[PDB]
# Entry
Amino acid sequence: GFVCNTCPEKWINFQRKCYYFGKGTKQWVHARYACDDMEGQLVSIHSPEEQDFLTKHASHTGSWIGLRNLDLKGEFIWVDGSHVDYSNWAPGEPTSRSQGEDCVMMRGSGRWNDAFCDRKLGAWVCDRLATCTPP
# Structure
């Protein structure tokens, strides 16, 4: 009821959320359900502070994040239903003439790239809300 920084075992706290830096070869949808079945969601990024934390723990070979183009014409939404306010797209991204590249990955640099959803990445990040210690 005061300090919201408690996380489950294997999850790392940053501000009022918990992050799971997953490993294992998964397509976007596979990583989506891996987070879901673990009481989390693929990571939603809403500030440069949150992004800097992610970049610090980001897999050098790339990670799936919770961003997906839904209407197939440039409208990206996070798995939790939230819209893009903060963005950390790599230059030229997202590409307009890249039909099928609907799923978003985070590079070792922390910058985002759009991708074919059936692409197998060796890492993926989940998030959930932290629990709180009462006063």
